[model samples]
Target: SRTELLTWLNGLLNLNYKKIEECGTGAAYCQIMDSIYGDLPMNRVKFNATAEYEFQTNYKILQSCFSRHGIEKTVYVDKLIRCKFQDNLEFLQWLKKHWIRHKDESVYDPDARRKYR
Candidate 1:
């Protein structure tokens, strides 16, 4: 199940992530938000992270992006910070719902976004 989810995410984001649990780093989730809004201040986002504080920064950026969009979803910030598989997978399911509506694979380029404008 995790592999399937991971595959789906990697496909959507054009990432090569092997585990959905890696979403706990918060970079993936924040980038997902970027796909939807295309307005994230991404220079501040850390794509590779091992520290929870770096993860927290990613989540804060995601939160800030959502706030800008006027979204009111209750993110499991604490649960996800733990990097447990179940919670991260659940959050992926939740975030995927928002993505489906605005998923435009041609323009929402993940690689270029990470590089720069």
Candidate 2:
């Protein structure tokens, strides 16, 4: 189960499989990373962090099928990812930290509100 989850997540992140394998099976880091970097958690955490929010949202659906209501992987992961993304703006910061300079200035400007029209 852990392998299946890790493989899928690493695929989504386009990470090297060898690095993930080193973490071993049943590693919480895999799930934690997904929750932090995955789009699902980013959208959800932007709104609410309450238990009631999860109980009524699609998160419950994902948990039911994928995790079978596993708290750490399902609920806690959601909270942690959301907190990191929103609290310190980790998502944007991460993009910036790894950003590559484009050759064309008009094509890629990080601070540009529009296409510089």
Candidate 3:
């Protein structure tokens, strides 16, 4: 648990900076890499291509939401590109509060996406 948090924070701080330089910007765009790399743990979710890829679902409804919406978009996670991640309860909560919904909105651009406080 402690190790996982360390790894994630390291990505956000150290590796993320390097990746931003490589990507040619540090503006921190809203993109898929955030979720894949932000909360779920890169070592587990695995990077696919172009810093973006397919969507994952948990329950049937979640999967169905992905399918029905035809949502396929990109995200940024320079932090993810250079680190290993692990799943922990706190990490999962963090993903829900931050990354996952952001990815969903970027991909779908749905009105619901903007309802956040």
Candidate 4:
């Protein structure tokens, strides 16, 4: 259920996001990726972006993150920037699984991870 997923996400990411579709901004997904791999250039992520290009910038960061880590999943940045509830939810579900497999035991603060944007 989305409710359960939200609970886990908020706990793991230290975020207060209220809806699954909000993940379409791609900031949250990028943060999750950083927590898993611990090497992303998070300061390069635009957290408060409103335009499509800003969203694309974030997704491009995520795609490169995936590629660098040998992740095989494809990110459809075009569809994600549209911010459809279904598309974001599907991506989040997959991300959750990846987090579980690569999650670290130490505490992680998503806010402190970012130095800019």
What are the per-residue Cα lDDT tens digits for candidate 2 across 1-117? 435444644553333443332222212232333333332242332121234444344334334434532433223434433434242233222222322221222232211211121
Give the per-residue lDDT of model 4 (tens digit) for 14-99.
Answer: 77778887888888889899998888888888887777778888898999999998999989987877888888888999999999
* Residue lDDT tens for model 1, 1-117: 788778888887778888777899889898888887788878889888889889999999988888888988888789988889899989898888888876666577788888832
> What residue runs in model 2 are displaced by over 4 Å at the alpha carbon?
18-21, 24-117
Model 3 CA RMSD to the hidden true structure, in angstroms = 14.6
Model 4 scores a C-alpha lDDT of 0.85
* Candidate number of the best TM-score: 4
When sorted by TM-score, best at the front, the candidate numbers are: 4, 1, 2, 3
TM-scores of the candidates are 0.90, 0.20, 0.19, 0.90
17-88 per-residue lDDT for model 3 (tens digits)? 222222212112222233333332223222222333222211222323334545453222333333223322
Clash count, one per candidate: 0, 0, 3, 0
- Enumerate residue pairs that collide in model 3: 31-75, 32-74, 32-75
RMSD to the native, candidate 1? 2.1
Task: List the global CA lDDT of all models.
Answer: 0.85, 0.32, 0.31, 0.85
For candidate 3, the per-residue lDDT at 67 reads 46
